[PDB]
Design a protein around this ligand. Sequence first.
Ligand SMILES: Nc1nc2ncccc2[nH]1
Length: 155
Amino acid sequence: GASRLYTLVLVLQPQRVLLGMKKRGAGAGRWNGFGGKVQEGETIEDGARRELQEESGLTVDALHKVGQIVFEFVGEPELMDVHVFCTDSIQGTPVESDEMRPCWFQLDQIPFKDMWPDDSYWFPLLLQKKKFHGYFKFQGQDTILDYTLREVDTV
Ligand SMILES: Nc1nc2ncccc2[nH]1
């Protein structure tokens, strides 16, 4: 249907959240959660666990579905269908790699100015343990043309 599955994992603990600064490629220069494309024959949740490991070095125990966000970029045919998960139970220490620099942020110091602009809209919901369905239409990397965002009981 001209949509591609992605995952996004937020390691969200009671007073802090882990974010990674991407060194190059999609989302370079921004703090973001950990995720990527889902593979053939892989469940979305299994893909989320794999991407968390690949990008942050962390092994997640329990993962919970928190949202689904569809991203449209004008002029690009494929919609990004992003399945968002959160966890507080992880193992390992975050690893800085060529591709990603990890840092913990206190919740009142989340660096929204250095994040994708849609984050400002749906992070308030994530932090209050709400679940959501969102859609954001972007022109380029920086401008939200329009959006919808609603809370839901089931993702
Ligand atoms: N956290 C996050 N926000 C995003 N917005 C647009 C594309 C990818 C994104 N990842």
